[PDB]
């Protein structure tokens, strides 16, 4: 959490330099690459800080949880039990929360800077045009438009708006999708409320799991939560996702709340958006599978689609489907260093991650980013601090590549700590191989006292 605050502080500093560079000044290319490198590092520390906390808590609670399901449980309380029962669903949501937090930090303060053309009514220009066409003085051209002003009229009549409202609807629907893509669904509801779409603000509440606490016959009176027809509402939202007459962003909004990955991927235009689309639907699909196994509904005669109810999920599969995609951007981002680390930390596969570090060192040693060698070192120190095993020949050669960076980017001093993190034979041999370069007498004495501040075997070193 302090490593994220250090990286986030330097991302803040570098952003407060790049935002002050004149566009096209080619000196700032390294400044922008350093900003993105430490931004991807910051969120990779965020990912580590969640998933390895869950995995250590689970491995301390698993002796104890002899749970019993209640015969009268609601959808909410089946899912409250699922998120205790199921570390695959729980870790999959921690990847959704993580990816939604990345999109949130790219939105920041900006929500209230959105100028629309409409400023007193919903569809104000089409409403004005209809109020003008009712006047017997209309010597205007009759552009085909809607004649009704419910929000289904464009799709029921198959007629357009005028293009000011048709810009504002397209502007608004991207901002609503961008807020839901950031977990800010309550801000998407507030933006709908702010744009006079209290109707679309209500549709953005229909996915909520059902609960009536009063079923247990309490001592005072409590509110009823959610939607007891959430299933019929998801079937209806899936129908709004698959007609080509709906906007790509409105289809994606209802898809991200009804499991329709197939209509969501048509808007997910980063690696993070594409991982998010798989994980967001994987949780929603596994939640529907536990609910439709535990909540015995009666006389419901429509199905949720068998492509989504019959969906087998694994973490490995999601990171094969992310390599079968046509989206060339995602195929190029799914080859960069932090996106590779993010795949392996999500899988929990430290064994393949150390073969990635070996596959990188064996090709690129002298050319690797200094902050990536700092990260690779501190991730190996984090795993060792948790007692987690690593391919120690590669761990030694990452540490030796880092000690060779630390000598050659220019620091001398910090080498002692990054050398006492080795077995004594190797700590002695690598600190001696450093001191075999030290000719300045004042620097010699200083580099012995820094070893005596680091519990090193100074006597076998010298």
């Amino acid at each position: 959490e302090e490593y994220e605050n250090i990286c986030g502080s330097q991302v803040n500093i570098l952003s407060k330099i790049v935002s002050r560079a004149t566009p096209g000044l080619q000196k700032f290319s390294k400044t922008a690459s350093m900003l993105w490198l430490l931004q991807q590092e910051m969120v990779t520390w965020r990912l580590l800080a969640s998933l390895y906390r869950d995995r250590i808590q689970s491995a301390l609670e698993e002796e104890s949880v002899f749970a019993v399901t209640a015969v009268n449980a609601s959808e909410k309380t089946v899912v409250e039990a699922l998120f205790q029962r199921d570390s695959l669903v729980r870790q999959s949501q921690l990847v959704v929360d993580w990816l939604e937090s990345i999109a949130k930090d790219e939105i920041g303060e900006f929500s209230d800077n959105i100028e629309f053309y409409a400023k007193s009514v919903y569809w104000e220009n089409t409403l004005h045009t209809l109020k003008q066409r009712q006047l017997t003085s209309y010597v205007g051209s009759v552009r085909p438009l809607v004649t009704e002003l419910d929000p289904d009229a464009p799709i029921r009549q198959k007629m357009p708006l005028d293009d000011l409202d048709r810009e504002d609807e397209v502007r608004l629907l991207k901002y609503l999708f961008t807020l839901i893509r950031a977990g800010m669904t309550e801000e998407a509801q507030r933006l709908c409320k702010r744009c006079g779409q209290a109707w679309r603000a209500a549709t953005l509440e229909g996915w909520k799991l059902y609960h009536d606490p009063n079923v247990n016959g309490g001592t005072e009176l409590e509110p009823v939560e959610g939607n007891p027809y959430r299933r019929i509402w998801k079937i209806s939202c899936w129908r709004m996702a698959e007609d080509e007459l709906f906007n790509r962003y409105e289809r994606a909004i209802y898809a991200a709340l009804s499991g329709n990955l197939k209509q969501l991927l048509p808007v997910c235009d980063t690696w993070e958006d594409t991982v998010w689309a798989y994980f967001r639907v994987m949780v929603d699909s596994l939640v529907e599978q536990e609910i439709q196994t535990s909540v015995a509904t009666l006389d419901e005669t429509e199905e949720l689609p068998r492509e989504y109810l019959g969906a087998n999920w694994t973490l490995e599969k999601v990171f094969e489907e992310l390599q079968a995609t046509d989206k060339k951007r995602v195929l190029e981002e799914n080859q960069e260093h932090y996106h590779i680390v993010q795949k392996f930390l999500i899988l929990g596969d430290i064994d393949g991650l150390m073969d990635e570090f070996s596959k990188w060192l064996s090709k690129s040693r002298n050319n690797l980013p200094g902050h990536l060698l700092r990260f690779m070192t501190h991730l190996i120190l984090f795993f060792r601090t948790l007692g987690l095993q690593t391919k120690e020949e590669v761990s030694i050669e990452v540490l030796k590549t880092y000690i060779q960076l630390l000598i050659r980017e220019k620091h001398t001093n910090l080498i002692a700590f990054y050398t006492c993190h080795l077995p004594q034979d190797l700590a002695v041999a690598q600190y001696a191989l450093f001191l075999e370069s030290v000719t300045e007498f004042e620097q010699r004495h200083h580099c012995l006292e820094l070893a005596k501040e680091a519990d090193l075997d100074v006597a076998t070193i010298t």
């Binding site: 007193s120 009514v121 919903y122 409403l127 209809l130 002003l149 419910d150 929000p151 289904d152 029921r156 409320k193 006079g196 209290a198 109707w199 603000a201 209500a202 549709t203 509440e205 229909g206 909520k208 009536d212 009063n214 016959g217 309490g218 009176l221 509110p223 009823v224 939560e225 959610g226 939607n227 007891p228 027809y229 019929i232 509402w233 209806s236 129908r239 709004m240």
Partner: protein, 268 residues
């Protein structure tokens, strides 16, 4: 008999009030279906909006959503499916009606559709920019009017006694509000169009025997004379069949505040 007698402990007063309301919340649908099923048979092919409203006046929300998906009114089906408890949607329609009235966009929507939006928003009457009023209980019987009070104008958790008092607050003369519920009659006077023009002799307005029994359950000292009078039961002042058999159940339930002239007139 069925939901309380399953319980192997003395059932809490709250659970008794809850299941007595859940039973009456079936009675107020079963009393409405044959008129809704005729109304829909007539309206469906001319106005699906009135047919959808009629289903909602019997709590047939599944059939209302089904007819809205069949008519091409899919956002009405979405809106109706979400209304089954969610107070946030009630307050969002409360805002949306306040928007459309102030912005004079109300007069650009169907009055029949505004009647559905007012019902869902929990508004018994809505006041438009034209100075038109939409009364949600207009043209209905007392049972659907009292069911609107029990399902749309009150929370899931309130008592029958509050729905029945809000219904009585809706058909009397006050100093501060117009009548909007129908003053609401025996089943032979329903649908008749009879706005009773306040008969200038009859100081007690006629009501249904089922309303008189709901008063006697709410108040142990409520009148038995209007409860046992055949005009509360049938279109015939000579049919005492139910009147005598109701009294010879109330006498067994230890109600004793009938007059001996009134028992003598019933028995004779």
């Amino acid at each position: 008999l069925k939901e309380l007698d399953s319980q192997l402990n003395e059932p809490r007063e709250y659970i008794q009030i809850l299941e007595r309301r859940r039973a009456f919340s079936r009675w107020l649908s079963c009393t409405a279906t044959p008129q809704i099923e005729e109304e829909v048979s007539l309206t469906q092919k001319n106005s699906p909006v009135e047919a959808v409203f009629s289903y909602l006046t019997g709590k047939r929300i599944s059939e209302a959503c089904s007819l809205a998906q069949q008519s091409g009114d899919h956002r009405l089906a979405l809106l109706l499916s979400q209304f089954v408890g969610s107070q946030s949607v009630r307050e969002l329609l409360t805002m949306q009606l306040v928007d459309w009235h102030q912005l004079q966009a109300d007069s650009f929507i169907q009055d029949e559709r505004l009647r559905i939006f007012a019902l869902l928003a929990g508004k018994p009457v809505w006041q438009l920019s034209e100075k038109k009023q939409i009364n949600v209980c207009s043209q209905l019987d007392w049972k659907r009017s009292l069911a609107i009070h029990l399902w749309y104008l009150l929370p899931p958790t309130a008592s029958i006694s509050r729905a029945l008092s809000m219904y009585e607050e809706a058909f009397q003369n006050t100093s501060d509000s117009d009548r909007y519920a129908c003053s609401p009659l025996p089943s032979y006077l329903e649908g008749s169009g009879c706005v009773i023009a306040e008969e200038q002799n009859s100081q007690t307005p006629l009501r249904d025997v089922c309303f008189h029994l709901l008063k006697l359950y709410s108040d142990r000292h409520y009148d038995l004379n209007q409860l046992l009078e055949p005009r509360s039961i049938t279109a015939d002042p000579l049919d005492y069949r139910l009147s005598w058999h109701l009294w010879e159940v109330l006498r067994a339930l230890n109600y004793t505040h009938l007059s001996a002239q009134c028992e003598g007139v019933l028995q004779a």
